[PDB]
CSV table of C-alpha atoms and ligand atoms in Angstrom, one decimal:
chain,number,residue,atom,x,y,z
A,1,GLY,CA,-0.1,-22.6,-14.1
A,2,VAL,CA,2.4,-23.0,-17.0
A,3,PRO,CA,6.2,-22.9,-16.4
A,4,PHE,CA,8.0,-19.9,-17.9
A,5,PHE,CA,5.1,-18.5,-19.9
A,6,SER,CA,2.8,-17.9,-16.9
A,7,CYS,CA,5.6,-16.2,-15.1
A,8,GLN,CA,5.3,-12.8,-13.5
A,9,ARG,CA,8.2,-10.4,-14.1
A,10,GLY,CA,9.8,-10.2,-10.7
A,11,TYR,CA,11.7,-7.5,-8.8
A,12,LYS,CA,15.5,-7.3,-8.5
A,13,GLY,CA,17.1,-4.5,-6.5
A,14,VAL,CA,17.4,-3.0,-3.0
A,15,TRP,CA,15.0,-4.1,-0.3
A,16,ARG,CA,14.3,-2.4,3.0
A,17,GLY,CA,14.2,-4.6,6.1
A,18,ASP,CA,16.1,-7.9,6.6
A,19,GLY,CA,14.6,-11.4,6.7
A,20,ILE,CA,12.8,-14.0,4.7
A,21,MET,CA,10.3,-13.2,1.9
A,22,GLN,CA,8.1,-15.8,0.3
A,23,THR,CA,5.8,-15.7,-2.7
A,24,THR,CA,4.1,-17.8,-5.3
A,25,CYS,CA,4.6,-17.1,-9.0
A,26,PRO,CA,1.6,-17.4,-11.3
A,27,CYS,CA,3.2,-20.6,-12.8
A,28,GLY,CA,2.9,-22.2,-9.3
A,29,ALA,CA,6.5,-21.9,-8.1
A,30,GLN,CA,7.2,-21.0,-4.5
A,31,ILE,CA,10.1,-18.5,-4.4
A,32,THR,CA,12.0,-17.7,-1.2
A,33,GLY,CA,14.1,-14.6,-0.8
A,34,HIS,CA,16.7,-14.1,1.9
A,35,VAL,CA,17.3,-10.4,2.5
A,36,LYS,CA,20.5,-9.4,4.2
A,37,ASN,CA,22.1,-5.9,3.9
A,38,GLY,CA,19.3,-4.9,1.5
A,39,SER,CA,20.2,-7.7,-0.9
A,40,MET,CA,18.1,-10.7,-1.8
A,41,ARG,CA,19.3,-14.3,-2.5
A,42,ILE,CA,16.6,-16.1,-4.5
A,43,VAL,CA,15.7,-19.8,-4.0
A,44,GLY,CA,13.3,-21.3,-6.5
A,45,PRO,CA,12.6,-24.2,-8.9
A,46,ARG,CA,14.2,-24.3,-12.4
A,47,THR,CA,10.6,-24.4,-13.7
A,48,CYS,CA,10.2,-20.6,-13.1
A,49,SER,CA,11.6,-17.6,-15.1
A,50,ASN,CA,12.2,-15.8,-11.8
A,51,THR,CA,14.7,-18.4,-10.6
A,52,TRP,CA,16.8,-18.0,-13.8
A,53,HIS,CA,16.7,-14.2,-13.7
A,54,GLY,CA,17.3,-13.8,-10.0
A,55,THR,CA,13.9,-12.0,-9.5
A,56,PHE,CA,11.1,-12.1,-7.0
A,57,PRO,CA,7.5,-11.8,-8.1
A,58,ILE,CA,5.5,-9.5,-5.7
A,59,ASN,CA,1.8,-10.2,-5.6
A,60,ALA,CA,-1.2,-11.1,-3.5
A,61,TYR,CA,0.6,-14.2,-2.2
A,62,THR,CA,3.8,-12.5,-1.0
A,63,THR,CA,4.7,-12.8,2.7
A,64,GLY,CA,7.6,-11.5,4.8
A,65,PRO,CA,8.8,-8.4,6.6
A,66,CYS,CA,10.6,-6.6,3.7
A,67,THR,CA,9.6,-4.2,0.9
A,68,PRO,CA,11.2,-3.2,-2.4
A,69,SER,CA,13.1,0.1,-2.4
A,70,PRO,CA,13.4,0.9,-6.2
A,71,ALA,CA,15.8,3.4,-7.8
A,72,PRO,CA,14.3,6.8,-8.7
A,73,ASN,CA,15.6,6.3,-12.2
A,74,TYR,CA,12.5,4.6,-13.7
A,75,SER,CA,10.9,5.5,-17.0
A,76,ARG,CA,7.2,4.6,-16.5
A,77,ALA,CA,5.2,3.7,-13.3
A,78,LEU,CA,1.7,2.8,-12.3
A,79,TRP,CA,0.3,4.9,-9.5
A,80,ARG,CA,-2.8,4.0,-7.6
A,81,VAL,CA,-4.7,7.3,-7.0
A,82,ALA,CA,-8.1,5.8,-6.1
A,83,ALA,CA,-9.6,2.5,-4.9
A,84,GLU,CA,-9.7,1.0,-8.4
A,85,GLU,CA,-8.2,3.7,-10.5
A,86,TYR,CA,-4.6,4.2,-11.8
A,87,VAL,CA,-2.6,6.9,-13.5
A,88,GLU,CA,0.5,6.1,-15.6
A,89,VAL,CA,3.5,8.4,-14.9
A,90,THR,CA,6.3,8.9,-17.3
A,91,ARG,CA,9.6,10.4,-16.0
A,92,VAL,CA,11.9,12.6,-18.0
A,93,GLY,CA,14.9,13.9,-16.1
A,94,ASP,CA,13.4,15.4,-12.9
A,95,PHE,CA,10.0,16.0,-14.5
A,96,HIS,CA,6.9,13.7,-14.4
A,97,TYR,CA,4.0,13.5,-16.8
A,98,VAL,CA,0.6,11.7,-16.6
A,99,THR,CA,0.6,9.7,-19.9
A,100,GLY,CA,-2.4,7.5,-19.1
A,101,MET,CA,-5.4,6.9,-16.8
A,102,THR,CA,-7.8,4.1,-16.2
A,103,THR,CA,-10.8,6.4,-16.2
A,104,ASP,CA,-11.5,10.0,-17.4
A,105,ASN,CA,-11.1,12.7,-14.8
A,106,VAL,CA,-9.1,10.8,-12.2
A,107,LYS,CA,-8.1,12.9,-9.2
A,108,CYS,CA,-4.4,12.8,-8.5
A,109,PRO,CA,-2.0,14.4,-6.1
A,110,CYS,CA,0.1,17.1,-7.7
A,111,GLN,CA,3.4,15.5,-6.7
A,112,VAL,CA,4.7,12.1,-7.5
A,113,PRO,CA,5.5,10.1,-4.4
A,114,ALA,CA,8.8,8.1,-3.9
A,115,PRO,CA,9.1,5.1,-6.2
A,116,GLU,CA,8.1,2.5,-3.6
A,117,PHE,CA,4.6,4.1,-3.4
A,118,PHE,CA,4.1,3.1,-7.1
A,119,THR,CA,2.2,-0.1,-7.7
A,120,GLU,CA,4.4,-0.9,-10.7
A,121,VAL,CA,7.7,0.4,-12.0
A,122,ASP,CA,8.5,-0.4,-15.6
A,123,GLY,CA,6.3,-3.5,-15.8
A,124,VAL,CA,7.5,-4.9,-12.4
A,125,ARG,CA,4.8,-5.0,-9.6
A,126,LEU,CA,6.0,-3.7,-6.2
A,127,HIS,CA,2.8,-4.0,-4.1
A,128,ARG,CA,1.3,-7.1,-2.5
A,129,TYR,CA,-2.3,-6.0,-3.0
A,130,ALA,CA,-3.2,-4.2,-6.3
A,131,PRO,CA,-6.6,-4.1,-8.0
A,132,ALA,CA,-6.8,-5.0,-11.7
A,133,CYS,CA,-5.6,-2.3,-14.0
A,134,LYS,CA,-8.3,-1.4,-16.5
A,135,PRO,CA,-7.2,-0.3,-20.0
A,136,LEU,CA,-5.1,2.8,-19.9
A,137,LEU,CA,-6.7,5.8,-21.6
A,138,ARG,CA,-3.9,7.8,-23.3
A,139,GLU,CA,-5.8,10.3,-25.5
A,140,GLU,CA,-8.5,13.0,-25.2
A,141,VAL,CA,-8.9,12.4,-21.5
A,142,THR,CA,-8.2,14.7,-18.5
A,143,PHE,CA,-6.9,14.4,-15.0
A,144,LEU,CA,-7.7,16.6,-12.0
A,145,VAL,CA,-5.3,18.2,-9.6
A,146,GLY,CA,-7.5,20.0,-7.1
A,147,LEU,CA,-9.7,22.3,-9.2
A,148,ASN,CA,-7.5,22.4,-12.3
A,149,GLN,CA,-7.9,20.0,-15.3
A,150,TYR,CA,-5.1,18.9,-17.6
A,151,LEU,CA,-5.0,16.9,-20.8
A,152,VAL,CA,-3.2,13.5,-20.8
A,153,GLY,CA,0.4,14.0,-21.6
A,154,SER,CA,0.6,17.0,-19.1
A,155,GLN,CA,3.4,17.5,-16.6
A,156,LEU,CA,2.3,17.2,-13.0
A,157,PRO,CA,1.5,20.8,-11.9
A,158,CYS,CA,3.8,20.9,-8.9
A,159,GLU,CA,6.9,21.1,-10.9
B,1,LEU,CA,6.7,-17.0,21.4
B,2,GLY,CA,3.0,-16.4,20.7
B,3,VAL,CA,0.5,-16.6,23.6
B,4,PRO,CA,-3.3,-17.1,23.1
B,5,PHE,CA,-5.1,-13.8,23.5
B,6,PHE,CA,-2.2,-11.8,24.9
B,7,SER,CA,-0.2,-11.9,21.7
B,8,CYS,CA,-3.2,-11.4,19.5
B,9,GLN,CA,-3.3,-8.6,17.0
B,10,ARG,CA,-6.4,-6.4,16.7
B,11,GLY,CA,-8.1,-7.6,13.5
B,12,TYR,CA,-10.3,-6.0,10.9
B,13,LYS,CA,-14.1,-6.5,10.8
B,14,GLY,CA,-15.9,-4.9,7.9
B,15,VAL,CA,-16.5,-4.6,4.2
B,16,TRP,CA,-14.0,-6.2,1.8
B,17,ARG,CA,-13.2,-5.4,-1.8
B,18,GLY,CA,-12.7,-8.5,-4.0
B,19,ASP,CA,-14.0,-12.1,-3.6
B,20,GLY,CA,-11.9,-15.1,-2.7
B,21,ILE,CA,-9.9,-16.8,0.1
B,22,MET,CA,-7.8,-14.7,2.5
B,23,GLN,CA,-5.1,-16.2,4.7
B,24,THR,CA,-3.2,-14.7,7.6
B,25,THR,CA,-1.2,-15.5,10.8
B,26,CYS,CA,-2.0,-13.9,14.1
B,27,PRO,CA,1.1,-13.1,16.3
B,28,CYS,CA,-0.3,-15.8,18.7
B,29,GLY,CA,0.6,-18.3,16.0
B,30,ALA,CA,-3.0,-18.9,14.8
B,31,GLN,CA,-3.7,-19.3,11.1
B,32,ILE,CA,-6.8,-17.4,10.2
B,33,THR,CA,-8.8,-18.0,7.0
B,34,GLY,CA,-11.4,-15.6,5.6
B,35,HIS,CA,-13.8,-16.6,2.8
B,36,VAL,CA,-14.9,-13.4,1.1
B,37,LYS,CA,-18.0,-13.1,-1.0
B,38,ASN,CA,-20.1,-10.0,-1.7
B,39,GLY,CA,-18.2,-7.7,0.7
B,40,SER,CA,-18.5,-10.1,3.6
B,41,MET,CA,-15.8,-12.2,5.2
B,42,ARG,CA,-16.5,-15.6,6.8
B,43,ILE,CA,-13.8,-16.1,9.6
B,44,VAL,CA,-12.3,-19.5,10.4
B,45,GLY,CA,-9.7,-19.9,13.2
B,46,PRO,CA,-8.9,-21.7,16.4
B,47,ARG,CA,-10.7,-21.1,19.8
B,48,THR,CA,-7.2,-20.0,20.9
B,49,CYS,CA,-7.2,-16.7,19.0
B,50,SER,CA,-8.9,-13.5,20.0
B,51,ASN,CA,-9.6,-12.9,16.3
B,52,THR,CA,-11.6,-16.1,16.0
B,53,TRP,CA,-13.8,-15.0,18.9
B,54,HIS,CA,-14.2,-11.3,17.9
B,55,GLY,CA,-14.8,-12.4,14.2
B,56,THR,CA,-11.8,-10.3,13.2
B,57,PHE,CA,-9.0,-10.7,10.6
B,58,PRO,CA,-5.5,-9.5,11.5
B,59,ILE,CA,-3.8,-7.9,8.5
B,60,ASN,CA,0.0,-8.0,8.5
B,61,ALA,CA,3.1,-9.1,6.5
B,62,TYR,CA,1.9,-12.7,6.5
B,63,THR,CA,-1.5,-12.0,5.0
B,64,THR,CA,-2.2,-13.4,1.5
B,65,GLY,CA,-5.2,-13.5,-0.8
B,66,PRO,CA,-7.0,-11.3,-3.4
B,67,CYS,CA,-9.0,-9.0,-1.2
B,68,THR,CA,-8.5,-5.6,0.6
B,69,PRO,CA,-10.4,-3.9,3.4
B,70,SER,CA,-12.9,-1.1,2.7
B,71,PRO,CA,-13.0,0.7,6.0
B,72,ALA,CA,-15.9,2.7,7.4
B,73,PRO,CA,-15.9,6.5,6.9
B,74,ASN,CA,-16.6,7.3,10.6
B,75,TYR,CA,-13.1,6.6,11.9
B,76,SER,CA,-11.6,8.8,14.6
B,77,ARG,CA,-7.8,8.5,14.1
B,78,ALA,CA,-5.7,7.0,11.4
B,79,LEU,CA,-2.0,6.3,10.6
B,80,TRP,CA,-1.0,7.8,7.2
B,81,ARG,CA,2.3,6.8,5.6
B,82,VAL,CA,3.4,10.1,4.0
B,83,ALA,CA,7.0,9.1,3.2
B,84,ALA,CA,8.9,5.8,3.0
B,85,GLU,CA,9.4,5.4,6.8
B,86,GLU,CA,7.5,8.3,8.2
B,87,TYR,CA,3.9,8.6,9.4
B,88,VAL,CA,1.4,11.3,10.1
B,89,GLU,CA,-1.5,10.8,12.6
B,90,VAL,CA,-4.8,12.0,11.2
B,91,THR,CA,-7.7,13.0,13.4
B,92,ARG,CA,-11.1,13.3,11.9
B,93,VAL,CA,-13.6,15.9,13.2
B,94,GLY,CA,-16.8,16.0,11.0
B,95,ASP,CA,-15.6,16.4,7.4
B,96,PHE,CA,-12.4,18.0,8.5
B,97,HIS,CA,-9.0,16.4,9.3
B,98,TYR,CA,-6.0,17.5,11.4
B,99,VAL,CA,-2.4,16.3,11.6
B,100,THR,CA,-2.2,15.5,15.3
B,101,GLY,CA,1.1,13.6,15.3
B,102,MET,CA,4.1,12.8,13.2
B,103,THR,CA,7.1,10.4,13.5
B,104,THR,CA,9.7,13.1,12.5
B,105,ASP,CA,9.7,16.9,12.7
B,106,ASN,CA,9.0,18.7,9.3
B,107,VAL,CA,7.5,15.7,7.5
B,108,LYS,CA,6.3,16.4,4.0
B,109,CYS,CA,2.7,15.2,3.5
B,110,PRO,CA,0.1,15.7,0.8
B,111,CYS,CA,-2.4,18.6,1.2
B,112,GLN,CA,-5.5,16.4,1.1
B,113,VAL,CA,-6.4,13.1,2.9
B,114,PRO,CA,-6.9,10.0,0.7
B,115,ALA,CA,-9.9,7.7,1.2
B,116,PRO,CA,-9.7,5.6,4.4
B,117,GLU,CA,-8.5,2.4,2.6
B,118,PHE,CA,-5.2,4.2,1.9
B,119,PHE,CA,-4.5,4.6,5.6
B,120,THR,CA,-2.0,2.1,7.1
B,121,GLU,CA,-4.1,1.8,10.3
B,122,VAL,CA,-7.5,3.1,11.3
B,123,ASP,CA,-8.4,3.4,15.0
B,124,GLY,CA,-5.7,0.8,16.0
B,125,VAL,CA,-6.6,-1.6,13.2
B,126,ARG,CA,-4.0,-2.4,10.5
B,127,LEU,CA,-5.3,-2.4,6.9
B,128,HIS,CA,-2.1,-3.0,4.9
B,129,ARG,CA,0.0,-6.1,4.6
B,130,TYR,CA,3.4,-4.3,4.4
B,131,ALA,CA,4.0,-1.4,6.8
B,132,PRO,CA,7.2,0.0,8.3
B,133,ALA,CA,7.5,0.3,12.1
B,134,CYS,CA,5.9,3.5,13.4
B,135,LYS,CA,8.2,5.6,15.5
B,136,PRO,CA,6.9,7.3,18.6
B,137,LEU,CA,4.5,10.1,17.4
B,138,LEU,CA,5.5,13.7,18.2
B,139,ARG,CA,2.4,15.6,19.3
B,140,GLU,CA,3.9,18.8,20.7
B,141,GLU,CA,6.0,21.6,19.2
B,142,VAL,CA,6.6,20.0,15.8
B,143,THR,CA,5.6,21.2,12.2
B,144,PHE,CA,4.8,19.5,8.9
B,145,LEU,CA,5.5,20.6,5.3
B,146,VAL,CA,3.1,21.0,2.5
B,147,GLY,CA,5.3,22.1,-0.4
B,148,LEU,CA,7.1,25.2,0.9
B,149,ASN,CA,4.7,26.1,3.7
B,150,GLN,CA,5.1,24.9,7.4
B,151,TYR,CA,2.1,24.1,9.6
B,152,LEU,CA,2.1,23.4,13.4
B,153,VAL,CA,1.0,20.0,14.7
B,154,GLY,CA,-2.8,20.1,15.3
B,155,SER,CA,-3.3,22.2,12.2
B,156,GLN,CA,-5.9,21.3,9.5
B,157,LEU,CA,-4.7,20.2,6.1
B,158,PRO,CA,-4.5,22.9,3.4
B,159,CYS,CA,-7.0,21.6,0.9
B,160,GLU,CA,-10.5,21.1,2.3
C,201,LIG,C1,-19.6,-3.3,9.1
C,201,LIG,C2,-20.1,-4.7,8.7
C,201,LIG,C3,-21.5,-5.0,9.3
C,201,LIG,C4,-20.0,-4.9,7.2
C,201,LIG,C5,-20.1,-6.4,6.8
C,201,LIG,C6,-19.9,-6.4,5.3
C,201,LIG,C7,-21.1,-6.9,4.4
C,201,LIG,C8,-22.5,-6.6,4.9
C,201,LIG,C9,-20.9,-6.3,3.0
C,201,LIG,O1,-18.9,-7.0,7.4
C,201,LIG,C10,-19.0,-8.4,7.9
C,201,LIG,O2,-19.6,-8.3,9.2
C,201,LIG,C11,-19.7,-9.6,9.8
C,201,LIG,C12,-20.5,-9.4,11.1
C,201,LIG,O3,-21.9,-9.4,10.8
C,201,LIG,C13,-18.4,-10.3,10.0
C,201,LIG,O4,-18.4,-11.6,10.5
C,201,LIG,C14,-18.0,-11.7,11.9
C,201,LIG,C15,-17.6,-10.3,8.7
C,201,LIG,O5,-16.3,-10.7,8.9
C,201,LIG,C16,-17.6,-8.9,8.0
C,201,LIG,O6,-16.9,-9.0,6.8
C,202,LIG,ZN1,7.3,-18.7,-12.5
C,203,LIG,ZN1,-4.4,-14.6,17.9
């Protein structure tokens, strides 16, 4: 529980649903977000990086009726495809590639979902519950889409 | 205003993934604590809450803690969030699943069901902390989209 250095990188952007969000940063700071017209006003202590940056750290201690609605313009995302398994997705233009996986031969859907179904987008967590991400395997591993296997680095087949 | 028993949300009773202290608020106003160790949750709450008496834990937008439900495979119906604010109802018969309802006509959903823990709601029990309001489910004369193909409501999912 250390100020600034313990701090989770928080979300800043459009939210869906209006009302009050609350969370606790890993430093110990309680952060309040007031969401009105999709836009969040942050209230926090000056002991937390999130207060300075206008951001809201989403995690297992987040409460409130709203959810992030991120822009579809991300570079990388973490996508939870099984109970404790993740795939990393890299976007280039309108195309999406699996550039990493937590375990060899993860089964994933052939199409990326909308950005708010991602557990993380560019290092920012979007989901309240998320299991720990094991080390991402980025070489000589394969993912499954139905009955077809593809080497890491491969575009998702439904494009 | 929250009323003992009448306001109470239907809570989860089952296996939990992760160990630690879970915390939630029932719509009746009760604060429910769950101590989770080795898959099992110990429920603490007031005599005023239907969840305390059933030994259940209501999962909602005011739930906190490091654990998630691991629901049982023998569920009948489930709510599956297939788009940002759209749901499909899934009915399970044997090892086979059917889309028996949808919140909007022509919803695009995946061709395969995920494991039960990825469902928003299983047999009237909410499993996720954040979930959008479910619109009335359309059960007659609607279709869903898997890629380019259309399927009528009641149809089995493509991949099985
Ligand atoms: C389907 C059940 C039996 C699985 C079992 C999990 C454990 C054995 C891993 O779940 C526990 O069952 C007991 C009731 O005995 C509940 O206390 C009231 C717990 O809240 C619940 O977490
Ligand atoms: Zn902080
Ligand atoms: Zn209650």
